[PDB]
Amino acid sequence: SIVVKNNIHWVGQRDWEVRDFHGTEYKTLRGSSYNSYLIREEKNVLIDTVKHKFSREFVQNLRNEIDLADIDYIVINHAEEDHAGALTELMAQIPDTPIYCTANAIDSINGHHHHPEWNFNVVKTGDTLDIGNGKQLIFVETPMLHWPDSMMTYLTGDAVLFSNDAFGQHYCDEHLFNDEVDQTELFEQCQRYYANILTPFSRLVTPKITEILGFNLPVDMIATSHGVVWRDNPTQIVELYLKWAADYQEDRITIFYDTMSNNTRMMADAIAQGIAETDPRVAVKIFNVARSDKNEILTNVFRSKGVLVGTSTMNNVMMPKIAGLVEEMTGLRFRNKRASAFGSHGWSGGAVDRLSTRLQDAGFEMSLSLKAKWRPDQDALKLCREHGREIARQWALAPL
Amino acid sequence: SIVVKNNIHWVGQRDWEVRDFHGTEYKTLRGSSYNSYLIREEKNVLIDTVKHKFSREFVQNLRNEIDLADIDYIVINHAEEDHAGALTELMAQIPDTPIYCTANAIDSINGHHHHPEWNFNVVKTGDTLDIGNGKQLIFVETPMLHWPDSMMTYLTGDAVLFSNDAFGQHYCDEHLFNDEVDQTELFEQCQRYYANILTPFSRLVTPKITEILGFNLPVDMIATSHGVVWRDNPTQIVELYLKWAADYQEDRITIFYDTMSNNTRMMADAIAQGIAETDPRVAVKIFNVARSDKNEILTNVFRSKGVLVGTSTMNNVMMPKIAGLVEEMTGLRFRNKRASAFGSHGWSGGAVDRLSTRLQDAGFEMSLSLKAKWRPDQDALKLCREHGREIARQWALAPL
Numbered sequence A, B: 001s002i003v004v005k006n007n008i009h010w011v012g013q014r015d016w017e018v019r020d021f022h023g024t025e026y027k028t029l030r031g032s033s034y035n036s037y038l039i040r041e042e043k044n045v046l047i048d049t050v051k052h053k054f055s056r057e058f059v060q061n062l063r064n065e066i067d068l069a070d071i072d073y074i075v076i077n078h079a080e081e082d083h084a085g086a087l088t089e090l091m092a093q094i095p096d097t098p099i100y101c102t103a104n105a106i107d108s109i110n111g112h113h114h115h116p117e118w119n120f121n122v123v124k125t126g127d128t129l130d131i132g133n134g135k136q137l138i139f140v141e142t143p144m145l146h147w148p149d150s151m152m153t154y155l156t157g158d159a160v161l162f163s164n165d166a167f168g169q170h171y172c173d174e175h176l177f178n179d180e181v182d183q184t185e186l187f188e189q190c191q192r193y194y195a196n197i198l199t200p201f202s203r204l205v206t207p208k209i210t211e212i213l214g215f216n217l218p219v220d221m222i223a224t225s226h227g228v229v230w231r232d233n234p235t236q237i238v239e240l241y242l243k244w245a246a247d248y249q250e251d252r253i254t255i256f257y258d259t260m261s262n263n264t265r266m267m268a269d270a271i272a273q274g275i276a277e278t279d280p281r282v283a284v285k286i287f288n289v290a291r292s293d294k295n296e297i298l299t300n301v302f303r304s305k306g307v308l309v310g311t312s313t314m315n316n317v318m319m320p321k322i323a324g325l326v327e328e329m330t331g332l333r334f335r336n337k338r339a340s341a342f343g344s345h346g347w348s349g350g351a352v353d354r355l356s357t358r359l360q361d362a363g364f365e366m367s368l369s370l371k372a373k374w375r376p377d378q379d380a381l382k383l384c385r386e387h388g389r390e391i392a393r394q395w396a397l398a399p400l
């Protein structure tokens, strides 16, 4: 275990090997961690657990830190399997131990564990839990951030905010604190996390942070459930969340496509050139969805002011990976972004219009489409270059 | 080169390494071949070429077999890059050589190569081309099998049908003839090919084969553009095509899904059990689309009488891989098949109905959906088992 602050002990689990989260929908290229915390004042409080596959090690390590019978209260901020997965294993040893959580958490905890006989205690925003020595836990409900059961626990005196998923990132390191790790690698994982997970809940992020700041409670540390503990200027991740929530976009255009014989690829490269030689301020990224990291693509879309999506016409419809990715974007609900569909066809085509429509369904403001037959020759590549020019002029943030 | 029959020489290219076709949409687990044929009578005729990346070797090997100037005619049955990719390289040495192909082939050849100055000769069904010694080539147009430019060339006397893509398969072997290779491995690749490529054109397969049989031309060998040359009972692949075209299905149910925390997986296994203990005649396959071969899944759907598709609700929509796969199935246009959507959700859900609708759009006859909240307990797993029972009774081919 690692001493977080005074009597706060990190008793979680590092995961260096993990490469897949939420099925295979979130690639964790730098691993992750599952942060559990043991607070030992007059009362002994355990905050969240770890993933189920590390339950054996979790309980054993917990035994080495404290007798399980001496644990007074258990707090569950979030009942997703990576934070409450070791719950059944632990409650088998101490079934009478009270569990403090939201009303929605009872549904989610029981939904996974099927032990409704456990002693649940419904908490709501403002509720307190005294642990002795002048310190107490203050609960704040954060529904749909990112789950209905989500909440945060604040420890007075030590001024430590247990935010669970919020302000966390999938980043594994032997050092626990943010000022002890690589800042660049830390920022990438933080932005990668929000873009792929918290984007559809951005409208809720700002009012919640505003509400919490209204409590006027000091924050010395922010102990998330994933990644580093923010102790050195901890509110820096809060400020990033405020910026990322306000329909974040840079002067950047993300182009991604799928192709069977490189015809659409040729179009994408010609479009990109037209943009770069029209607007030097625009950062341009290009991805083949069949050969690229899906989450890296989505992170760029989040940072971009607009995207161009390419697909060849395959069996009167679009290519599956493109359709799949667009479907996911429909759930992420990106805002204040523009889009243009393009692609090659053999005869009748139809996949470009089909794509443009679904992008509109995903919330993108659609510009005109670009279509080409078979492999683009020099003349066709000019039209693609010109399309990029028209896009660059239409999507220009400042005049030029 | 390999002697196919008399003066027919195989001058194509084997591809042991290839693992991806049509982008990454067709996995070639046993490699493939690109069959080109040189006929040397009084006239010298080249039939199709190879993929562009093997163009250097193709021309060189062709030089070792014959002087390029001695080539009289060039036949292009199909202008896809794997059969006409080495065309530009070859025509650079012999630009005056006539090219015999369909009217639609001129559009496709020029579309890729951009050399309209080539000497094209439009052929239609019934047209002949004398090559001497009492032998001649007879052309038969096969539009949308699988391309608009597709055609077949028949050689009289030797009774050899050059079918290009038709009756071919992606299977690489040192031996050229069908009776020299592994029959099981040969059948798998043949069925894998049709299911993923020729399924949406099944309505056209039967009348075309009927028309060709109406010509009363003998067939000693069938020389495709991919895989083995059928010389031992060559019509066996024709009979398989007739069966596969007639909305082929076995007493078989294919279940596939995507899951984030295995809840939907638990549902799929419970459904499968219900079916097996209700109808012992049904063959059941289960696939996680995130961890399985996509084409193996589609091959099973082709053989199946009906499918069950699972998805968890993710951001108010379905999982991308499922959406992507369903999109592709919408293009494959499977016929006379039934379907049932299922999956787990956290709160409001919605992805199961969304999936059931798109399956209906894909042409599946939809049965009732099955929904479960979070992780299924013993009671919920009974409902899933019962759902399988109801499906097994509804989809039963014979009474029982």
Ligand SMILES: Cc1cc2nc3c(=O)[nH]c(=O)nc-3n(C[C@H](O)[C@H](O)[C@H](O)COP(=O)(O)O)c2cc1C
Binding pocket: A258, A259, A260, A261, A262, A263, A264, A265, A311, A312, A313, A314, A315, A316, A317, A344, A345, A346, A347, A348, A349, A350, A373, A374, A375, B022
């Ligand atoms: C399996 C397959 C299916 C196709 N289906 C269509 C189609 O339905 N309509 C069409 O106009 N072209 C169709 N085509 C032709 C392609 O759209 C054409 O080759 C395109 O220019 C290539 O795009 P890409 O190289 O960027 O992947 C199909 C090609 C393949 C290989």
Ligand SMILES: Cc1cc2nc3c(=O)[nH]c(=O)nc-3n(C[C@H](O)[C@H](O)[C@H](O)COP(=O)(O)O)c2cc1C
Binding pocket: A022, B258, B259, B260, B261, B262, B263, B264, B265, B311, B312, B313, B314, B315, B316, B317, B344, B345, B346, B347, B348, B349, B350, B373, B374, B375
């Ligand atoms: C990223 C993510 C998004 C989710 N979105 C929804 C949702 O929009 N609606 C819902 O009812 N449940 C949602 N859930 C909860 C899942 O549907 C729930 O955990 C489900 O039972 C798990 O299915 P599975 O384990 O088979 O993948 C979401 C879960 C995750 C991890």
Ligand SMILES: [Fe+3]
Binding pocket: A078, A080, A146, A165
């Ligand atoms: Fe979570």
Ligand SMILES: [Fe+3]
Binding pocket: A080, A082, A083, A165, A225, A226
């Ligand atoms: Fe988490």
Ligand SMILES: [Fe+3]
Binding pocket: B078, B080, B146, B165
């Ligand atoms: Fe082809």
Ligand SMILES: [Fe+3]
Binding pocket: B080, B082, B083, B165, B225, B226
């Ligand atoms: Fe082919």
Ligand SMILES: [Kr]
Binding pocket: A145, A146, A165, A166, A167, A198
């Ligand atoms: Kr969160």
Ligand SMILES: [Kr]
Binding pocket: A145, A166, A167, A205, A208, A209, A241
């Ligand atoms: Kr937040």
Ligand SMILES: [Kr]
Binding pocket: A209, A212, A213, A238
């Ligand atoms: Kr906050």
Ligand SMILES: [Kr]
Binding pocket: B145, B146, B165, B166, B167, B198
């Ligand atoms: Kr074909």
Ligand SMILES: [Kr]
Binding pocket: B145, B166, B167, B205, B208, B209, B241
């Ligand atoms: Kr055919």
Ligand SMILES: [Kr]
Binding pocket: B209, B212, B213, B238
């Ligand atoms: Kr035939």
Ligand SMILES: [O]
Binding pocket: A078, A080, A081, A082, A083, A165
């Ligand atoms: O989580």
Ligand SMILES: [O]
Binding pocket: B078, B080, B081, B082, B083, B165
């Ligand atoms: O092909």
